Amino acid sequence: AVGIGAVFLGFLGAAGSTMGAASMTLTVQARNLLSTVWGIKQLQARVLAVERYLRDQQLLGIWGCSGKLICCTNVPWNSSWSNRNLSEIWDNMTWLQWDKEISNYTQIIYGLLEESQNQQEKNEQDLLAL
Amino acid sequence: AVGIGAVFLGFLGAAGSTMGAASMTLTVQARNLLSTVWGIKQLQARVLAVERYLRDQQLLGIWGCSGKLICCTNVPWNSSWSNRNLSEIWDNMTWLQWDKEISNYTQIIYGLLEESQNQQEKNEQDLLAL
Amino acid sequence: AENLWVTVYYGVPVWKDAETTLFCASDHNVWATHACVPTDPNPQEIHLENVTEEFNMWKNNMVEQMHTDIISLWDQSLKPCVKLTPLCVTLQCTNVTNNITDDMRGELKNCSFNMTTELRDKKQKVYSLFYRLDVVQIKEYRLINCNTSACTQACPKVSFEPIPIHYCAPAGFAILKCKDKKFNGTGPCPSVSTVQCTHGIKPVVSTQLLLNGSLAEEEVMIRSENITNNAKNILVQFNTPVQINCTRPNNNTRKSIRIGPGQAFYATGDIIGDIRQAHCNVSKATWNETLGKVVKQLRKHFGNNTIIRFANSSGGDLEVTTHSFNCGGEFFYCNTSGLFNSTWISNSNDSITLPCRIKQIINMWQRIGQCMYAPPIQGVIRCVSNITGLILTRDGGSTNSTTETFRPGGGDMRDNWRSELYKYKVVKIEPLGVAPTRCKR
Amino acid sequence: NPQEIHLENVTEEFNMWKNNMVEQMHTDIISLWDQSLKPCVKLTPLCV
Amino acid sequence: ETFRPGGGDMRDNWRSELYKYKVVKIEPLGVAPTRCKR
Amino acid sequence: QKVLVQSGAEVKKPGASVKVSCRAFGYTFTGNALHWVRQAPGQGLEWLGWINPHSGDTFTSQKFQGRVYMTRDKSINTAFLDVTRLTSDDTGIYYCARDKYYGNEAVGMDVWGQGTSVTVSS
Amino acid sequence: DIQLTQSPSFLSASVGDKVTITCRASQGVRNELAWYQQKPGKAPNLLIYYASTLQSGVPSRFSATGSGTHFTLTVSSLQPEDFATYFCQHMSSYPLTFGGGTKVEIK
Ligand SMILES: *[C@@H]1O[C@H](CO)[C@@H](O[C@@H]2O[C@H](CO)[C@@H](O[C@@H]3O[C@H](CO)[C@@H](O)[C@H](O[C@H]4O[C@H](CO)[C@@H](O)[C@H](O)[C@@H]4O[C@H]4O[C@H](CO)[C@@H](O)[C@H](O)[C@@H]4O)[C@@H]3O)[C@H](O)[C@H]2NC(C)=O)[C@H](O)[C@H]1NC(C)=O
Ligand SMILES: *[C@@H]1O[C@H](CO)[C@@H](O[C@@H]2O[C@H](CO)[C@@H](O[C@@H]3O[C@H](CO)[C@@H](O)[C@H](O)[C@@H]3O)[C@H](O)[C@H]2NC(C)=O)[C@H](O)[C@H]1NC(C)=O
Ligand SMILES: *[C@@H]1O[C@H](CO)[C@@H](O[C@@H]2O[C@H](CO)[C@@H](O[C@@H]3O[C@H](CO)[C@@H](O)[C@H](O)[C@@H]3O)[C@H](O)[C@H]2NC(C)=O)[C@H](O)[C@H]1NC(C)=O
Ligand SMILES: *[C@@H]1O[C@H](CO)[C@@H](O[C@@H]2O[C@H](CO)[C@@H](O)[C@H](O)[C@H]2NC(C)=O)[C@H](O)[C@H]1NC(C)=O
Ligand SMILES: *[C@@H]1O[C@H](CO)[C@@H](O[C@@H]2O[C@H](CO)[C@@H](O)[C@H](O)[C@H]2NC(C)=O)[C@H](O)[C@H]1NC(C)=O
Ligand SMILES: *[C@@H]1O[C@H](CO)[C@@H](O[C@@H]2O[C@H](CO)[C@@H](O)[C@H](O)[C@H]2NC(C)=O)[C@H](O)[C@H]1NC(C)=O
Ligand SMILES: *[C@@H]1O[C@H](CO)[C@@H](O[C@@H]2O[C@H](CO)[C@@H](O)[C@H](O)[C@H]2NC(C)=O)[C@H](O)[C@H]1NC(C)=O
Ligand SMILES: *[C@@H]1O[C@H](CO)[C@@H](O[C@@H]2O[C@H](CO)[C@@H](O)[C@H](O)[C@H]2NC(C)=O)[C@H](O)[C@H]1NC(C)=O
Ligand SMILES: *[C@@H]1O[C@H](CO)[C@@H](O[C@@H]2O[C@H](CO)[C@@H](O)[C@H](O)[C@H]2NC(C)=O)[C@H](O)[C@H]1NC(C)=O
Ligand SMILES: *[C@@H]1O[C@H](CO)[C@@H](O[C@@H]2O[C@H](CO)[C@@H](O)[C@H](O)[C@H]2NC(C)=O)[C@H](O)[C@H]1NC(C)=O
Ligand SMILES: *[C@@H]1O[C@H](CO)[C@@H](O[C@@H]2O[C@H](CO)[C@@H](O)[C@H](O)[C@H]2NC(C)=O)[C@H](O)[C@H]1NC(C)=O
Ligand SMILES: *[C@@H]1O[C@H](CO)[C@@H](O)[C@H](O)[C@H]1NC(C)=O
Ligand SMILES: *[C@@H]1O[C@H](CO)[C@@H](O)[C@H](O)[C@H]1NC(C)=O
Ligand SMILES: *[C@@H]1O[C@H](CO)[C@@H](O)[C@H](O)[C@H]1NC(C)=O
Ligand SMILES: *[C@@H]1O[C@H](CO)[C@@H](O)[C@H](O)[C@H]1NC(C)=O
Ligand SMILES: *[C@@H]1O[C@H](CO)[C@@H](O)[C@H](O)[C@H]1NC(C)=O
C-alpha cells in the first residue's frame, strides 16, 4: 500500500508487537528508566532506580556492549536454550513471551558474555603489543 | 610570536573565550560535574547531581556519542536553526551566546540524534548478519 | 553547498540561573559547625575573563535558603534544653530600689514565687529579678509569654557568638561572584569569578544597624530594590566602620534553682553594687562624618539641592523601633534617637550615648508562640562592634515638599543576609551543546 | 550460605586497637538501646 | 605481678569479638607499563 | 583587579644569590605566562626570561642561562626568580610581568609588579 | 639578539602637538611589537600590542602603525600626563628585547 511514515506508540506501546517490530522502539523505553519521612522513602526510591540503571549499564559494558542498544556478540547460541529457528521468533512472537521462555536461561549467558569480553580485551591487548 | 605552551584557565575560565578556544577545555568542565535534616537535604542534592550526570550520559549514549567529548554525527544541519556559516561561530562567539541562540532549537535535535542512532544500530546489525 | 552536520560537545562552559540547596563549610555554639564540611585551606577562585553576568540581590534565593538555615540551626540548638512550663505561675513582685539611678526606677522587679522541686510533692519558695519588659501585672505579676506559649530556656553552655559560615554549591553548580566595586547589586556585572564556597559570613542578628559585616572598598554604597518606592528598604554599606561600645554595667549574680529531676532554671540573684543603665557609645565625629558620606551618596538619587533629614523610628515592636542585638548572651534594645536626629542642607572626644534596655524573653524571628528565655550572664558584660551599614526607610515623599526624611528600619533578617550575599549567585552548568561542523560520522 | 573467599598468598596488617568496627558497633548498640526505650513510660511521677 | 579485674567500657567487650576483622575499600583502577600503543 | 606584588628590596655582596618573589592576585595564576625583566638605573629594560606557571617550563635569555633560575609554587600563586653569582652590574629594579598570552604566545606585558630593587655592591 | 632603534632619543614638544616616534628593527617582526610607557620610578604600562591594537583603558589619542621592520607610534594631541619614557618591544624570537627609549618632555 501507500504509507506516510513511522508513528509513535508511546512508552511501552510496542509491548504487544513482534520482537522485530518492538526492536524499533528501544530508545523509547531506554529514556524513561531514569526519570521528613516522605523525603526518605522518595530518596530510597530514587537511589534504587539509579542503582538498577547503573547495574544494567555495567552489565552491558562488561560485555563490550557499552553505549549500544543492539549489540551482536561472539558467544554462539547454545541450542539447549531455544530450538526456534528464526521465522517464529522475530515475526511471530513478542518480547514478553520470549522473556517467559528464557527467564530460565539468563545468568549463564551473562557470565559467558563477561568472560568472552575479557578474552577480547586481552587479545586486543596482545594485538596492539605488536 | 614565541610561546611557551598551553596554560590552565580553571574550571570555567574559557566561558568568555571563543567556541573554538573553549572546545579545548571540555574535560575541565567534565570532571567537576560529579564532585538528621542536613543529612537529608545534602543527600537529596547528591542524588540530584548524580541523576543529572547520568541523564546527560544516557542522552550522549543513545546518540552513539558514548565515551566522547566531541562527537560528530550523521544528522545534517537544518539551516532553519542557524544561518551563520562558520567564520562567525567558532572564532567570533562564545558558547554562552550560542546557547542563548539555540535554547529554542534543542529538543528536536536530541530526538533526531536518538532515531538516527537506532537506525545506525540496526544497519550495523544487518551488515554483520552477512 | 555548506555541508554542515550536527556535532555534540560535552563539557561546554555554559550555565543557567538555578535554585539549589547549598551546603555549609567552616574552619558549644548555636551556629552548629559540627555538621559543616571543613573549609579548604586554599580556596580556589577562577577569574572569568570577558564574562558579563546578570545579578539581582533582591531575588537571590541564597538569602532565602540562608534564612531557613539560620532559623533551623536556632531551633535545633534549643531542642535539648529546659522547657520553662513551671515558670508560668503567679509572681509576687516588689520594686528593686537598692542603689538604682533615676533612669532605672521600676525597670527591675524582685519577684517571689512558688516553684516545683525535684520531688513531685514538694514546693520551694524562691525569688528572682525580672525585667519590667518581661512581666505583666495580673503586686501580682506573670511572665509576658504565659498567655501565648511556654518558653524554652537557652542551654547556658551554648554560645551565641556568630561564627563565619561559607556557602558552597554542589556538583554541577557554580557560585558566580561579582568582583565589581561600585556594584549596586542589580544589573550587569562585567567582572565575574567562580568560587566553590562564599566567604565567611557571620550570622549577626541585629536591627537598624548592620554589625560586624563587610565594608565597601571604594565608598558608601546605597542599594534599594526600587529607590523611588518608599515601601522598599534602603541598604547602606559603609566604607569605614563606626565603633560602637555596648555595656551592661550591672554585676549580675546567677543562681540555679532545681525545678525538676535534672532541670535547672537560672534566676537572677542580686546585683552586686550599684544598679545603672546599660548603654552604647558611638563616636560623635565619626558618626557625623559617616552620615555626611551617606547624605552625599543619597543626593545622587534624591536630588543635588534636596534637604536630607534623619529622624527616629516611626513605631511598632520593641525589636524594630530600637537597635536590637545580642552582646555576649544578653539581649540589648537600644534607643537610636541620638543617631538619627539631624538635617543636612545642600551647600572632639565626646560621644553619643544610646540608652539600652535588656530583655530575657526573646522572639528572635518574626514568629509568634515560639519564645526563648535567655539565662542571666554572670558579671558585667561589655562588647565592641563595627557598624558597617544601615537599614533605612524613606518617609512619605510626595511632590509637595523638597525634604527627604529617612528613618532606621529592620526586623526582617533577610535584609541582613542580603547585605552579605549581594555579590553572589548560583548557576547550574549546562555541559551539553550542539553546533554545526563539517564532519560526518 | 555465606561465602568466604580464602586469599592465598595475602599477608595483611591488622590492629584490633584502632579498629573502627568497634567504634561503629558501640554507636549502633547505644542507638538501638536508646530507640528501644523511646516508646516507654517516663517515670517522672515516681520522684516523690 | 598483680592483676585485678577491670571493665566498664564496653568497647573492650566488642573488641574481643572483632579483633580478627578489618574493613578495606577496593581500588579497582590501576596503571601499568605494557608494549601496546593505541 | 589584577595585581602582582613582589618581595622587598635586597642589598647583597658580589658573588651572592638573591631570591625575588612575585605573587598574583585578581587573575588565575596558571592562565598567563610570566616574564621577568630588569631595569638598571637610568637605562632601558632588559628581558631576563619567562615561565609557564601551569607546566613549569621556562625560557631564559641565552646570556643568562645557567645563572638565573625561574620556579613557581601554585599553592601560593607565586613565582620565584633566583639570580646567583651576583655582580655590581646586576644592580637594578626587577619586575615580574603577566603576559596577555593570546593563542599561547607572547602578546604583551599588561600587568606589572611594583618592582624590587636589588643592589649589589662590595 | 635583535636590535630596536628609536628616534628621537630625546624630544621636546608642547601640549596639543602631535608626536611621532619611530622604532626600527634589524630583522623582521611581522606585527609582534608592543609599545610601553614608563614614568619616573614606576613600572611601565602596555600601550599598544600587535603593533596596531590599543590596550584597553588607554586614551584614543594613542595610535600605532607599521609591520615588518618599521613602526611609528603617534599621539595626536599631547597631554601633560603623556610626558614620559617610551619603549618598543618585539617578541617574534628570543631574546625579547626593548628599544633604547624616547623621553618626551614639555617645552
Ligand atoms: C562583633 O565582634 C566582636 C569581636 O569579635 C564581639 O565582641 C566580642 O564578643 C565575645 C563574645 O561576646 C567576647 O568574648 C567574651 O569575652 C569575655 C571577657 O573575656 C569572656 O568572659 C567570655 O567567655 C565567657 O563566655 C563564653 C561564651 O560566650 C564561654 O565559652 C566562656 O567559658 C565564658 O563563660 C564563662 O564565664 C561566664 C561569665 O562568668 C559564665 O556565664 C559561663 O557560665 C562560664 O562560666 C567571652 O569569651 C569578646 O571579648 C568580645 N570582644 C570585644 C573586643 O568586644 C561582638 O560581640 C560582636 N558583635 C555582635 C553584635 O555580635
Ligand atoms: C497485534 O496483533 C495482530 C495480529 O494478531 C497484528 O496484526 C497483524 O499485523 C501483521 C503485520 O503488521 C499482518 O501481517 C500482514 O499480512 C498481510 C496478509 O497476510 C501481508 O500482506 C503483510 O505484508 C503483512 O505480513 C497481519 O495480517 C496482522 N493480523 C491481522 C489479523 O490483521 C497487529 O499488528 C498487532 N499490533 C501491534 C501494535 O503490533
Ligand atoms: C576576551 O576577549 C578579548 C577581546 O574580545 C580577547 O582578546 C582577543 O583575543 C584574540 C585571540 O584570542 C585576538 O585575535 C588576534 O588578533 C591578532 C590581530 O588582530 C592576530 O594577530 C592574532 O592571531 C589573533 O587572531 C584579538 O585581537 C583580541 N582582542 C583584542 C581587543 O585585543 C581575549 O582573548 C578573550 N579572553 C579569553 C580568555 O578568551
Ligand atoms: C529581693 O527580695 C528578697 C526577699 O525579700 C531579698 O532577700 C532578703 O534579703 C535580706 C537582706 O537584705 C535577708 O535578710 C533576707 O533573709 C532575704 N530573704 C530571702 C527570702 O532570701 C533580696 O535582698 C531582694 N533583692 C533586691 C535586689 O531587692
Ligand atoms: C506560695 O504558696 C503558699 C501556700 O500555697 C502561699 O501562701 C498562701 O497564700 C494565700 C493567699 O493567696 C493564703 O490564703 C494562704 O493562707 C497562704 N498559705 C500559707 C500556708 O501561707 C504563698 O502566698 C505562695 N507564695 C507566693 C510567692 O506565691
Ligand atoms: C572593625 O573594623 C576594622 C577595620 O576594618 C577591623 O580591623 C581589621 O581587621 C582585619 C582582620 O580581618 C585586618 O586584616 C585589618 O588590617 C584590620 N584593619 C584595621 C584598620 O585595624 C576590625 O577587626 C573590625 N572589628 C570587628 C569586631 O569586626
Ligand atoms: C517603583 O515603585 C513604584 C510604586 O510606587 C512604581 O511606580 C508606580 O506605579 C504605579 C502603578 O500603577 C502608579 O500608579 C504610580 O503612580 C507609580 N509611581 C510613580 C511615582 O509614578 C515604579 O514603576 C517602580 N519602579 C520600577 C523601576 O519598577
Ligand atoms: C560610655 O561613655 C560614658 C561617658 O559619657 C562612660 O562613662 C564613663 O566611664 C568611665 C569608665 O572608665 C568612667 O571613668 C567615667 O567617670 C564615666 N563618665 C561618665 C560621665 O559616666 C561609659 O563608661 C562609656 N561606656 C562604654 C561601654 O564605652
Ligand atoms: C570603644 O572602646 C575602645 C577600647 O575598647 C576605645 O578605644 C580607646 O580609644 C582611646 C581614645 O579616646 C585611646 O586612647 C585608647 O588607647 C583606646 N583603647 C584601645 C584598647 O584601643 C574607644 O575609644 C571606644 N569608643 C567609644 C566611642 O567609646
Ligand atoms: C523619637 O523622638 C520622639 C520625640 O523626640 C519620641 O517621642 C517621645 O515618646 C515618648 C514615649 O511615650 C513620650 O513620652 C515623649 O513625650 C515623646 N516626645 C515628644 C517630644 O513628643 C519618640 O519616642 C522617639 N522614637 C522612638 C522610637 O523612641
Ligand atoms: C529615646 O530617646 C529620646 C531622647 O531622650 C526620648 O525622648 C525623650 O522622652 C522623654 C520622656 O521619657 C522626654 O522627657 C524627653 O524630653 C524626650 N527627649 C527628646 C529629645 O525628645 C524617647 O522617648 C526615647 N524613646 C523611648 C521609646 O523611650
Ligand atoms: C515602682 O516604681 C515605679 C517608678 O518609680 C512606680 O511607678 C511604681 O508605682 C512602683 N511600684 C511599687 C512601689 O510597687
Ligand atoms: C496576652 O496578654 C497581653 C497583655 O495582657 C495581650 O496584649 C495579648 O493580646 C495577650 N495574648 C493573647 C493571645 O491573649
Ligand atoms: C544601579 O541600580 C539601577 C537599578 O535600576 C541599575 O539600573 C543600574 O544599572 C545600577 N548601576 C549600574 C552602574 O549598573
Ligand atoms: C562582681 O562581684 C564579684 C563578687 O562580689 C567580684 O568578685 C567581682 O570582682 C565583681 N566584678 C566587677 C566587675 O565589679
Ligand atoms: C535632636 O537634635 C536637637 C537639635 O536640633 C536637640 O535639641 C535634641 O536634643 C536632639 N535629640 C536627641 C535625642 O539627641
Give the strand pairing for C37-38 and C23-26: parallel
C-alpha cell at C398: 510626595
Per the DSSP assignment, residues forming a β-bridge with G35 are: G48, G88
What's the CA gap between D7 and C231, in Å, rounded?
A: 75
Nearest to C375 by CA among C331, C333, C334, C322: C331
* H helices present in G1-107, as ranges: none
Kindly give the pairing relationship between strand C351-359 and strand C278-283: antiparallel
CA dist., res. D47 & res. C121, Å (int):
8
CB contact under 8 A, F113 and G50: no
Q: Where are the beta strands (DSSP E) in chain F?
A: 3-6, 10-12, 17-25, 34-39, 45-51, 58-60, 68-73, 78-84, 92-99, 109-112, 116-120
Query: In a 3-state reduction of DSSP, which class is residue E26?
Result: coil
Q: How far apart are CA C225 and CA C229, in angstroms?
A: 8
Contact flag G44-F45 (C-beta cutoff 8 Å): yes
Q: Which residues precede gaps in chain C, with C-N > 2.5 A?
A: 27, 138, 347
Q: How far is CA F73 from the centre of its chain?
A: 14
Q: Compute the distance from residue C58 Cα to the ligand 14 centre, in Å.
A: 13
Residue of B nearest to C51 (CA): B16
Find how far residue C342's CA is from the centre of its chain: 26
Hey, which residues does F19 pair with through a beta bridge? F82
Residue A7 included in any domain:
no
Nearest to F111 by CA among C47, G24, C42: C47
Tell how far CA F2 is from the center of its chain.
17
- One-letter amino acid identity for C373? Y
- This structure was determined by cryo-EM
Residues recorded for chain F: 122
Q: Please, which residues bridge with residue C258 across strands? A: C264
Alpha carbon dihedral C322, C325, C331, C333, in 10-degree steps, equals -10
Query: What is the Cα–Cα distance from C249 to C381, expressed in whole angstroms?
Result: 6
Q: Ligand 16, residue C341: give the atom nearest the CA.
A: 1
User: Which CATH architecture describes the domain G1-107?
Assistant: Sandwich (2.60)
Answer for the pair C189, C41: CB distance below 8 angstroms, yes or no: no
Distance CA F98, CA B17 (A): 19
**Which of C224, C253, C330 is CA-nearest to residue C96?**
C253
Cβ separation A129–E36 shorter than 8 A: yes
Name which of A56, A7, A8, A62 is nearest A30 in CA terms: A56
Chain breaks in chain A (C to N over 2.5 A) after: 35
In this structure, is residue B32 part of a structural domain? yes
What CA–CA distances, in Å, run from C72 to C369, E31, G68? 16, 47, 69
Instruction: Choose among A73, A79, A60: nearest CA to A119.
Output: A73
- The distance of A43 to chain B (nearest Cα, Å) reads 7
Cell numbers for C413, please give them. Answer: 533578617
- Sign of the CA dihedral running C55, C59, C65, C70: positive
Backbone angles phi, psi at F44, to 5 degrees: -85, 180
Half-sphere exposure of C129 (CA within 13 A, CB side): 23
C227: left (phi over 0), alpha (psi -120 to 50) or beta: alpha
Q: ∠ CA(C144), CA(C148), CA(C151), 5° rounding?
A: 70
Neighbour count for residue A16 (Cβ, 10 Å): 12
Other Cβ atoms within 10 Å of C260 Cβ, number: 19
- What residue owns the CA closest to ligand 4's atom 22? C270
* G–C contact: 3+ Cβ pairs < 8 A: no
**F97 within 8 A of F79, measured Cβ to Cβ:** no
Q: Are C20 and C173 in contact (CB under 8 A)?
A: yes
Cα–Cα distances (Å) from F21 to C96, C247, F9, F80, in that order, read 67, 47, 11, 5
DSSP secondary structure letter of residue G2: -
Instruction: Report the distance separating Cα A102 and Cα G107, nearest Å.
Output: 101
Rg (C-alpha) for chain D, rounded Å, is: 21
- Number of neighbours of residue A4 by Cβ within 10 angstroms: 5
SS3 A28: helix
Cell of B37: 535534616
Give the 3-state DSSP-derived string for chain C, with helices as H, strands as E and coil as C.
CCCCEEEEECCCCCEEECCCCCEEEECCECCCCCCCEECCCCCCEEEECCCCEEEEHHHCHHHHHHHHHHHHHHHHHCCCCCECCCCCCCEEEEECCCCECCCCCCCEEEEEEEEECCCCCCEEEEEEEEECCCEEECCEEEECCCCCCCEEECCCCCECCCCCEEEECCCCEEEEEECCCCCCCEEEECCEEEECECCCECCCCCCCEEECCCCCCCCCEEECCCCCCCCCCEEEEEEEEEEEEEEECCCCCEEEEEEECCEEEEEECCCCCCECCEEEEEEHHHHHHHHHHHHHHHHHHHCCCCEEEECCCCCCCHHHHCEEEEECCEEEEECCCCCCCEEECCCCCCEEEEEEEEECEECCCCCCCCEEECCCCCCCEEEEEEEEEEEEEEECCCCCCCEEEEEECCCCCHHHHHCCCCCEEEEEECCCEEEEECCCC
Residues of C with Cβ-Cβ distance to B75 under 8 angstroms: 5-6
Nearest to C249 by CA among C128, C98, C101: C101
Please report the DSSP string for B27-60 in residue order.
HHHHHTT----TTTHHHHHHHHHHHHHHHHHHHH
Task: Identify the closest residue of chain C to D42 by CA–CA distance.
Answer: C261
DSSP notation for chain B: ----------SSTTTTS-HHHHGGGHHHHHHTT----TTTHHHHHHHHHHHHHHHHHHHHHTTT-TT-SEEEEEEE--TTT----GGGTTTT--HHHHHHHHGGGSHHHHHHHHHHHHHHHHHHHHHHT-
**Residue labelled with grid coordinates 529554542:** B104
Residues 6+ apart with CB under 8 A from A122: none
Q: What is the spatial distance between Cα C429 and Cα C409, in angstroms, rounded to a whole number?
A: 38
The answer to whether residue G45 neighbours chain F at the CB level (below 8 Å) is yes
- In DSSP notation, A109-121 reads HHHHHHHHHHHHH
Measure the CA–CA gap between C257 and C126, rounded to whole angstroms: 8
In a domain, A3, yes or no: no
Nearest residue in chain A measured CA to CA from B68 = A67
> Which structural domain, as residue segments, surrounds residue B39?
12-128
Residue D4 C-alpha cell reads as 568466604
d(CA C23, CA C173): 12
Task: List F71's β-bridge partners, or say none.
Answer: F80
Cα–Cα distance, C151 to C180 (Å, whole number): 46
Q: Is residue A85 one of the residues assigned to a domain?
A: yes
Omega within 30 of 0 (cis) for the link into G95: yes
Are the Cβ atoms of D29 and E10 closer than 8 angstroms? yes
Integer Cα distance of C236 and A100 in angstroms: 73
What are the angstrom distances between the C-alpha of C244 and each of C63, C112, C276, C332, C348? 27, 37, 19, 13, 16
Contact indicator for G89, G100 with CB cutoff of 8 Å: no
CB of C178 closer than 8 Å to CB of C192: yes
Residues with Cβ within 8 Å of A39's Cβ and at least 6 positions away in sequence, in order, are B40, B44
Q: Coil, strand, or helix at residue D26? A: helix
The cell for B17 is 573565550
Q: Do the Cβ atoms of G43 and F115 come within 8 Å?
A: yes
Q: How many CB atoms lie within 10 A of CB C235?
A: 25
**C-beta C74 within 6 A of ligand 4:** no
Ligand 12: residue whose CA is nearest its atom 8:
C106
DSSP-derived letter for residue G96 is P
Joined together, the cell numbers standing for residue G97 give 628585547
Q: Which residues pair with C29 in a beta bridge?
A: C159
User: Rounded to an integer, what distance in angstroms lies between the CA atom of residue C38 and that of residue C165?
Assistant: 11
Which class for C368: exposed (0-12), middle (13-18), buried (19 or more C-beta within 10 A)?
Answer: exposed
Residue C436's CB: how many other CB atoms inside 10 A? Answer: 21
**C-alpha cell at position C326:** 545580642
Q: How far apart are CA C50 and CA C61, in angstroms?
A: 25
Strand partners, C429: C15
Domains: count for chain A: 1
| Tally of residues, chain G | 107
> Would residue A105 count as lying in a domain?
yes
Length of chain B: 130
**Are B15 and C13 within 8 A, CB to CB?**
yes
- CA-closest residue to ligand 16 atom 14: C338
- Angle formed at CA D31 by CA D26 and CA D34, multiple of 5 degrees: 130
DSSP A105: G
Q: Which three cell numbers stand for residue F119?
A: 643592589
* Cβ density class D9-46: b for 16+ within 10 Å, e for less: eeeeeeeeeebebbeebbeeeeeeeeeeeeeeeeeeee
A residues 68..127 contacting E (CB < 8 A): 125
Q: How far apart are CA A71 and CA C120, in angstroms?
A: 78
Compute how many other C-beta atoms are within 10 angstroms of the C-beta atom of residue D2. Answer: 3
- CA separation (Å) from C59 to C56, C62, C148, C422? 6, 9, 34, 10
- Cα-trace Rg, chain G: 13
Q: Are B82 and C436 in contact (CB under 8 A)?
A: yes
Which value, to the nearest 10 degrees, does the dihedral of the CA atoms of residues B104, B109, B110, B111 take? 110
Asked if the Cβ–Cβ distance from F1 to C46 is below 8 Å, we say no
How far apart, in Å, do the first and last CA atoms of chain D sit? 56
Judge contact between F106 and F33, C-beta under 8 A. yes
Q: Which residue has the least CA distance to atom 12 on ligand 1?
A: C328
Spatial separation of the C-alpha atoms in residues C138 and C88, rounded to whole Å:
12
Within 10 Å of residue A108's Cβ, how many Cβ atoms?
10
Which helix (DSSP H) or strand (DSSP E) does residue G23 occupy?
strand G19-29
Q: Is residue B4 part of a domain?
A: no
Q: How far apart are CA F65 and CA F82, in angstroms?
A: 12
- Cβ neighbours around C396 below 10 Å, total: 10
In the beta sheet, which residues pair with residue G96?
none
